[PDB]
Structures are given as structure tokens and as C-alpha cells.
Amino acid sequence: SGLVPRGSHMTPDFLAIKVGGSLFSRKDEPGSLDDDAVTRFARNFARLAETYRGRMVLISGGGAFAFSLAGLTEATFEVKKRWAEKLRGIGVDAFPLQLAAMCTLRNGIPQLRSEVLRDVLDHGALPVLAGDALFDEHGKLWAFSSDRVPEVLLPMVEGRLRVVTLTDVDGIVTDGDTILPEVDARSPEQAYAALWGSSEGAMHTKLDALVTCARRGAECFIMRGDPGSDLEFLTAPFSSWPAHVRSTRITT
Amino acid sequence: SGLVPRGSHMTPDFLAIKVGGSLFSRKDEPGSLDDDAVTRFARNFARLAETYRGRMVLISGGGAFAFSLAGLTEATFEVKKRWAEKLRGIGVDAFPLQLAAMCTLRNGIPQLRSEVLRDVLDHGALPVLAGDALFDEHGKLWAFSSDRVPEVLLPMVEGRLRVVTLTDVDGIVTDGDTILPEVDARSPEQAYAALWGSSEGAMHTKLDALVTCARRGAECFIMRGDPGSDLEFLTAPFSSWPAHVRSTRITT
């Protein structure tokens, strides 16, 4: 692999945007989605998809569920269908892809085993992905969080990958409370210490996944999602972002 | 490829069983499935899956639907989910797999592009498949009938593949009317002549797919499905089948 120019003044070559289930559903209303939230988020993701044509995936959270874990693949398929239907309704070539048919685990590491994802991107379409039940090398099913799906893109994406995880907080909170603006993935021990101090394991899962991505060059963010908020700044160099934006940025 | 012993006295090494949508749904009641039919068929397929552990796929018909064809992948996912849920309910390790995430078209020929299907079989599970919208090499979506799904298995299955398409007739009818018992895939022109004479293109699609499979060694059947009917004879050599069974058998 050759030298990849990187930095806060560079434009991303690929966007993996993950939308947390908490932003468009409620745990105490299982299976129901907030259609107004989905609709408004979809308009903002559609704009991103126009610019990042063939250079973006949308990952949906939500769709929570010996072999009973198989029902998870069906649950998270439904959530991908809901986003893809909405996005096609507004002119985006959105196509849901079952991660379980494309990816398996080996030694705990997700392995992309289907060429289809790269082809769909090359055709200019928008894959809609989600967490899933994945088989390992012994045939055992494991729940693979939506928050870890960006990891599967690492060997396949060329150039500068930006990963954005939209959640119900502005980033990782630390001791009053304040957001930790930057985390160095090479040695992120202080971010993990902040989580212990400000909790009560979904944020820990996010941190582990985004550290993994950042160690492989990605520019990663945990930030607050809001259905109606404009996301066009996610196409731009980090140094050009509006002043109001708050996030935890994870890089190496 | 070495010499494969074949003939009506040999046991199949693999079963691809396709259940027609007409057998468990109604065109005039779109999206609804007949749960009693699904339940009774599932009990019979579960028995087959016990014997053909890792050596069978179930293909569901039904789930009918620029990029609007994408909705087909969602529709046929639902039908796979319905069968897989039912089969897991009776102890079968049934896992639905989106063919569109595993297979694309090149020069009109389906190409298996994901290793997951073979792995799932090797783990001893039952893949549940269906027709789908598949991308071609130019990024165009095509409707790929459930009736053609056995074609995708041809390069992957070793040994003797038996393909059984369950439909609402006993086979191909010819001129009174009688069932054509045998078709030679090397030169099946009389079967196509029978279809022209006894019609008014789903049976033609079946015939084309099963001729394609038979020319690659498969032993193929068009026969009548019935939810409650015992299917154990499908594990046995054709020469051992009960006398009451009627079918059109397609081989080369």
C-alpha cells in the first residue's frame, strides 16, 4: 500500500454513516420505528449519497432481536428494508444487503466473503447495511453489532475513509462534564477511563470499533444525530466544519 | 472432474427442493401466505433436512413484487423469513440467505460470488433461498425467478444433485391429456412443443432451468406439491419410488 495523504484539511474518499437505533425507535415500543425520524434522516442521507455516489454506505442500528440467533438476521433485514424503501422513495438507489450472506467470522475478525458489496458501490448504488448474526469458522452464530459494521469495510475501501456514528450524545463525556474532543487510537486509554467514570456496553462497543477503524487509517466520529439536521459538512475536511458541531474525533 | 456414477438406482448426494408460490399463497390475496400450508409443508421439508443435513437447500417461490426492482429483494426476503421461522420452530437450523448479496449476472449467467452458501451447508445448516433482483455486470437489476435458483448451485454441488420443483400440476401435460414422464435435456424439443399445445411463462421458465441443470448432470423433476404429503421418497433412488408418484423427470 502506498502513501495516502491524510489530515484534517483533506476531503474523505468514502463515508460510512451509522445511524443509531435510539434515534428512530424506542426500546419500550419494540419493532416500531418513528417514521417521521426515518423520513427526515433519509432526506439528509440522500444528499450525502448524491455527492458520495458509489462512495458511501448507510449502516442502520436497531432491529434488535443454538440457532435462535438466526432470527436476528431477519430482524435487522427489516430495518435495512425500511431505510432502503424510504431512500428509494426520494430517488436514491438504495439496496439493502444482508451482512450474514457476505461476511463470516474467523478468529473473531469479520471477513468479507462476497464480492457483491464492492460491485454495488462501483455501480453507483447505496448499500444499506446493519448489524447481523454472523457464522464463525465453527458454524456458531454470533451477534455482530451495527456499531462494528464499519470494520468490515477496512480492507475494501481505498483512500480516506470517514466513519460517523450518530448517537444520542455529543461524544464521549468526561469529568463538570465535557465532551472529549480527540482520541488517539494508538493509545486511547483515557477515553476508556472516561466511559467507566460516566456510565450507569454500547458506547464501549462504539469506541472499540472506531479505534479499530482509526488504527487502519480511518477518521472516525461519535456525535449527536438529529433527524432534521443538515449533514453536508460530513462531505468536507474536518478543519472546515461549522463551529457549532460537537463530536469526539478518533484518529491515529 | 472425474467419473460420477449416475442412474435411477443411485441415491442423490444433494437435494434442491423448490416450493411453488401457488402452493402456499394466492395471487388475489397479495402478501398473505396460507399458514396451514406453510406449516404442513415445513414438517415434510424438516424430515428431508434431517437426512440431507448440509446436503439440501429449500427454495421458496412467491414473494412477488430504474431501481424499483430493488423492492423485489425485500419481498422475497420476507418469504424466506417465513419459511425459516417456521422451520426453526420445529427444530431445523434454517437460515435465510439473500441471493442478491451472493450472486450477480454476467452475460446472463448467474455467478455465485459469496462463499457463505457453501460454508452454511458445511456447517450442517439449511439455507432457505428464493428468487431475487440480481445486478448484472453493468449495474442493471433483473428479476431472477425462484425457478432458476437451482442453476446457481451447479458449480458448487459435488456428486449427484437432485432438483425437485413442486407445483400445482403433476408434470408437463401433453396430448386425451397425459403427463410426459421423461424429457432428455440433450434434445428436449418435444417438451417445449407440449407446453405450446397445453397453455393459455412460468412452466417454460421451469423447463429452461431444469434442462440447464440436467445438462450439467442433475436429476430434475416437475411434480405436484401437496402440503401434507410425505416426501421421504425424495431421499431414495428414482427406481425405488412408490408407484403412486407422478412427475416429469428431466435428465441427460
Min Cα separation B179/chain A (Å): 39
**Cell of residue A148, nine digits:** 462494528
* Closest approach of A119 to chain B, Cα-based (Å): 8
Q: How far apart are CA A110 and CA A121, in angstroms?
A: 19
C-alpha closest to that of B151 among B234, B95, B199, B216: B216
Query: How far is A118 from A240, CA to CA, in rounded Å?
Result: 30
DSSP A124: T
Whose CA is closest to B98, among A116, A147, A112, A93? A116
Distance from the Cα of B188 to chain A's closest Cα (Å) equals: 35
CA angle A75, A77, A79 (to 5 degrees): 80
Distance CA A170, CA A194 (A): 14
**CB-nearest partner of A114 from B70, B84, B101:** B101
Give me the amino acid identity at A234: L
What resolution in angstroms, rounded to 1 decimal?
1.5
Q: Closest Cα partner for A157 from A132, A126, A187, A121?
A: A121
**Eight-class DSSP state of A241:** S
Contact A102/B96, CB-based, under 8 Å?
no
Query: In A67-223, which ranges are continuous DSSP H helix?
Result: 70-89, 116-122, 149-152, 189-197, 202-215
> Residue type for B64, please?
A
Distance of CA A152 to the CA centre of its chain: 11
Nearest to B97 among A84, A101, A123 (CB): A101
If one counts every other C-beta atom within 10 angstroms of the C-beta of residue A164, the result is 23
Closest Cα in chain A to B133: A95
| Kind and range of the H or E run holding A130 | strand A126-130
SS3 track for chain B: CCCCCCCCCCCCCEEEEEECHHHCECCCCCCCECHHHHHHHHHHHHHHHHHCCCCEEEEECCCCCCCCCHHHHHHHHHHHHHHHHHHHHCCCCEEECCHHHCEEEECCEEEECECHHHHHHHCCCEEEEECEEEECCCCCEEEECHHHHHHHCCCCCCCCEEEEEEECCCCCEECCCEECCEEECCCCHHHHHHHHHCCCCHHHHHHHHHHHHHHCCCEEEEEECCCCCCCHHHHCCHHHCCCCCCEEEEEC
B114 and A102 Cβ atoms separated by less than 8 Å: yes
- Tell me the H-state helices in A15-136: 35-51, 70-89, 116-122
Q: Measured between alpha carbons, how far is B104 from B83 in angstroms, rounded to an integer?
A: 24
Please state whether beta strands A141-144 and A132-135 pair in parallel, antiparallel, or not at all (unpaired): antiparallel
Per-residue exposure over A49-83, b if at least 16 CB sit within 10 Å of its own CB, e if not: beebeebbbbbbbbbbeebebbebbbbbbbbbbbb
Contacts of A102 in chain B (CB under 8 A): 101-102, 114, 116
Range of the domain at A44: 1-252
The identity of residue A23, as a single letter, is L
Contact A95 B67 (CB under 8 A): yes
Fill in the DSSP letter of residue A160: -
Cell of B34: 396460507
Q: Return the CATH number at B46.
A: 3.40.1160.10
CA distance A215 to B111: 35
Rounded CA separation B51/B60 (Å): 20
Three-state DSSP at A201 gives coil
The residue to which cell 443538515 is assigned: A230
Among the listed residues A112, A105, A125, the one whose alpha carbon sits nearest the alpha carbon of residue A157: A112
What is the spatial distance between Cα A239 and Cα A10, in angstroms, rounded to a whole number?
A: 8
Length of chain B measured in residues = 252
- Mapped onto helix, strand or coil, the DSSP state of residue A198 is coil
Question: Quick check: B124 and A139 CB within 8 A?
Answer: yes
β-strand B103-106 against B109-112: which pairing, if any? antiparallel
- For A21, residues 6+ apart whose C-beta sits below 8 A from its C-beta are A60, A61, A62, A63, A64, A79, A146
Instruction: Please give the backbone phi and psi of residue A199, each rounded to the nearest 5 degrees, phi first.
Output: -165, 140
For residue A198, what are the CA distances in angstroms to A165, A173, A193, A218, B30?
19, 7, 9, 26, 51
3-state class of A11 per DSSP?
Answer: coil
Q: How far is A84 from chain B (nearest CA, A)?
A: 9
What angle in degrees, to the nearest 10, is found between the helix axes of B35-51 and B70-89?
70
A249, A238 contact by CB (below 8 A): yes
Distance of CA A31 to the CA centre of its chain: 20
What residues of B are in contact with residue A120 (Cβ under 8 Å)?
135
- Number of neighbours of residue B161 by Cβ within 10 angstroms: 23
Total domain count for chain A?
Answer: 1
Distance, C-alpha A4 to centroid of its chain: 22
Amino acid (1-letter code) at residue A110: P
Alpha carbon A28 to its chain's center: 23
In the block, cell 437426512 appears at: B51
Closest among A118, A110, A61 to A216, alpha carbons compared: A110
Strands A109-112 and A56-60: what pairing?
unpaired
